[PDB]
Each structure stands twice: as structure tokens, then as C-alpha cells.
């Protein structure tokens, strides 16, 4: 019945910054408003209950205020470990949650550390060859990977994913996998991962010669 609306949808801020997230109720809910913190892939964790009560063991930089319809969660000194999605929740009626506010950390530029992994002998025996390129601990998240096989730009045979922001150093990592048949793999010599990122003045190539 009672609908909860959170603002903003996301915030990006520097370490030490004050962050303010708001939660609005469709009707008066007194002080029965809870705040949860959720890391990607993990269970929500209670931070604040009854609008303004700090949960046991939660850092004092977290505070809540409000009564009635308008509520705020405040992080007074944003820390790298505060990267998360934050949810409000009313418990005046049957529990309903806000849609969340993603909080991300701004930090200095960091170039990726680039690594390459040829296919394992185990996989090659099965008839497939996956070549993995790893971009470690970079910032900002925007990074471009291009696969080149014997200097020929590849298309349609790779997939990639980026991590969530790191809770300690606020960086991202990226993994790209190039997949071809064992037969195709053995028709070519040089397998190259070419990386473009703000921290690099020119594209960085990481490569190996088959064998």
C-alpha cells in the first residue's frame, strides 16, 4: 500500500565527502523507517532503524533523520567501503522498500595492469580455445579491449564483464574472453589483447605467440 521513493538514483562522491540520500513515503509513517546497505551479490545489512537509531556496530558517520513522510540518510565522511546500494524501508504497514540509491566513489586515475592467459591444455583437449585478457585495478571504469589475432581485429568471438567497484581501493577490474575452436586457434600465431584507458597515453598491447 505505502510506496517509498528514494532520491537520487545514484551518487558519485570523493572519499571524505558528505553524502545525503532521501526517502519519501506516500503517507505518514511516523518514525518506522529503516535503512539498509547492500553490496553486490550480498545480503542487505541494517544500518539505521526507527528513522534515527544507529544499529550496533555500524560506524557513527552513518546517521538518519526524519518523521512523517520525508527521511534522510547521511554519510558524513564517505569511505571506500561505503560503496553499496542503500535502501529505505517502511514498517508502518506491510513492509515496503524504496528502489535504492547506488553510491559510488570518485578517485584518482589508475591505469590497468594488463595480463593474458593462453588456453589451458585441458580445454584444448576438449576442442575449444579460450584466451583470457585481464585488466586489473583501474579507474575510471571506461576501458576498451580489442582482440587481434595475427594483427587482424576480431569481432563476434569475445565476451567481457567488469567488476563492481572495489571496497578498498575503489578501482574496477575487467575480464575479456576470446573463444575459438581448437582448429581455428592452431591456424594462427599471435594472440593480442589491446587496451585503451584514460590512464594510458597510447593503447597497450599484451600478446603471446602460440607455443
Amino acid at each position: 500500500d505505502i510506496q517509498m521513493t528514494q532520491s537520487p538514483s545514484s551518487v558519485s562522491a570523493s572519499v571524505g565527502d558528505r553524502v545525503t540520500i532521501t526517502c519519501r513515503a506516500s503517507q505518514g509513517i511516523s518514525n518506522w523507517l529503516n535503512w539498509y546497505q547492500q553490496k553486490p551479490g550480498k545480503a542487505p545489512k541494517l544500518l539505521i532503524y526507527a528513522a534515527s537509531s544507529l544499529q550496533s556496530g555500524v560506524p557513527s558517520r552513518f546517521s538518519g533523520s526524519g518523521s512523517g513522510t520525508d527521511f534522510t540518510l547521511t554519510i558524513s565522511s564517505l569511505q571506500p567501503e561505503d560503496f553499496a546500494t542503500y535502501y529505505c524501508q517502511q514498517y508502518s504497514d506491510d513492509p515496503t522498500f524504496g528502489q535504492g540509491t547506488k553510491v559510488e566513489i570518485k578517485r584518482t586515475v589508475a591505469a590497468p595492469s594488463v595480463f593474458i592467459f593462453p588456453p589451458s591444455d585441458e580445454q584444448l583437449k576438449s576442442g575449444t580455445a579460450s584466451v583470457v585478457c585481464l585488466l586489473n585495478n583501474f579507474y575510471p571504469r571506461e576501458a576498451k579491449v580489442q582482440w587481434k589475432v595475427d594483427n587482424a581485429l576480431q569481432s563476434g568471438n569475445s565476451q567481457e564483464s567488469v567488476t563492481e567497484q572495489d571496497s578498498k581501493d575503489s578501482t574496477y577490474s575487467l575480464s575479456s574472453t576470446l573463444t575459438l575452436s581448437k582448429a581455428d586457434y592452431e591456424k594462427h600465431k599471435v594472440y593480442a589483447c589491446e587496451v585503451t584507458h584514460q590512464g594510458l597515453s597510447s593503447p597497450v598491447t599484451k600478446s603471446f605467440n602460440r607455443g
Partner: protein, 217 residues
């Protein structure tokens, strides 16, 4: 310490029923209610209902009334959530939580239930060996490639959870075939590759895949 331990991820065909369990630590059932909350992957949180293990009394959210049954077994301190007539949109991570009636203060680890008619497939696990092509200023990167599985999730630990620093376990990618793949990597000292053992512990509970792969230079 308070802990709520849930049952493993499951695939279920449309129209079937799923029953997720939630094992609570001592003292919980005698002092707290247990709520169930679900979260569609990439979406928000939705309360399903609660049980008071004391009296066995339940409260269900309007939208799940008639489809959800929440039970509690006080002898084992285990709560259960059964959801019948499963449809594609019931694919979600299901959480149990300790419920004071005013907040949810401790939550189980979550259970991903995927509603699909497609076939379950366990992954192959291949090493990503450390070499001269995966070193950087005295550090070496290594990992495991977890290829061709359905549905989600795969979990990866290193050395039974004793190795966590420098670990990146990447979000799964969806292949054109409908199968998933993921990578898990770790950076370690290059100096000790000869003396340390690195093992990725890969779990895919929907397919009973439990693989411990030693990754050697």
C-alpha cells in the same frame, strides 16, 4: 553470534513449487519472527511474509496470498518458504531475515531460484596459469575459467576461503547458447609460486558441481 543459513540455489520448471529453508542460530526462534524478502536480479526488494515461530502465526503480503506458505520447525530452528505455481517472474534471490516486527536486523545469505524449462548444465573448470605473461612488478596473476553452465549462480572461493586479498570474481557473461561463463582471478607474490598452492573452489549447486582446481605455473 546470529546466523541464518539458507539452502542452495535451484532451477525449477514453470508451474512447479520451490521450498527454501532457513536454519537459524540458537535463541532466534524464541525471541524473533522470521520474514522472507525477495529481490529479482537487477531489481529491488519485495516482502513476501512473516512467521512467528512461537505461535506459528503467519502474515503474507497481498500479492503472494494463496501462493506462499511459510512454516517453522522449532525442533531444528528452521524456517521454510514454499512458493507454488512458479512463473518466469519468480526468478529471484530469496532472503530470510530475523524480524523484530520493527526491522530486519540479520539476513540469510540468499537463495537464487531460477524458473526455466531449459536444461541444467554444470561448468567445466580450467586453470588460468601464472606465467611471464601474467606478471607485473613482482606480482603474478592466476585464476580459474568457469565455462558453460546454466543457470546462475557459480560461486568461487580460493584456498577454502583463506585467500581473499587480491581476488576478483567477475560477473557472469551470457553466451549466445544461453549458457553462462565466469572468471575468477587472484594476484599473488611471484616469489612464492614454487611453495604456495592455489586452488579455486567452484560451486554450481543447481548441477551438483563442486570442483577444486589446483592452478599451477
Amino acid at each position: 553470534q546470529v546466523q541464518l543459513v539458507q539452502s542452495g540455489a535451484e532451477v525449477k520448471k514453470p508451474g512447479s513449487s520451490v521450498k527454501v529453508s532457513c536454519k537459524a542460530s540458537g535463541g532466534t526462534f524464541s525471541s524473533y519472527a522470521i520474514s522472507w524478502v525477495r529481490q529479482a536480479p537487477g531489481q529491488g526488494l519485495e516482502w513476501m511474509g512473516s512467521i512467528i515461530p512461537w505461535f506459528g502465526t503467519t502474515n503474507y503480503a497481498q500479492k503472494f496470498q494463496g501462493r506462499v506458505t511459510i512454516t517453522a520447525d522449532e525442533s531444528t530452528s528452521t524456517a521454510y518458504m514454499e512458493l507454488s505455481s512458479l512463473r518466469s517472474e519468480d526468478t529471484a534471490v530469496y532472503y530470510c531475515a530475523r524480524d523484530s516486527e520493527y526491522y530486519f536486523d540479520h539476513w540469510g545469505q540468499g537463495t537464487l531460484v531460477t524458473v526455466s524449462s531449459a536444461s541444467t548444465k554444470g561448468p567445466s573448470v580450467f586453470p588460468l596459469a601464472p606465467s611471464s605473461k601474467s606478471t607485473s612488478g613482482g606480482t603474478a596473476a592466476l585464476g580459474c575459467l568457469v565455462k558453460d553452465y546454466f543457470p546462475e549462480p557459480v560461486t568461487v572461493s580460493w584456498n577454502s576461503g583463506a585467500l581473499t586479498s587480491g581476488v576478483h570474481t567477475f560477473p557472469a557473461v551470457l553466451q549466445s547458447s544461453g549458457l553462462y561463463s565466469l572468471s575468477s582471478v587472484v594476484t599473488v607474490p611471484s616469489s612464492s609460486l614454487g611453495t604456495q598452492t592455489y586452488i579455486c573452489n567452484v560451486n554450481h549447486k543447481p548441477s551438483n558441481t563442486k570442483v577444486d582446481k589446483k592452478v599451477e605455473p
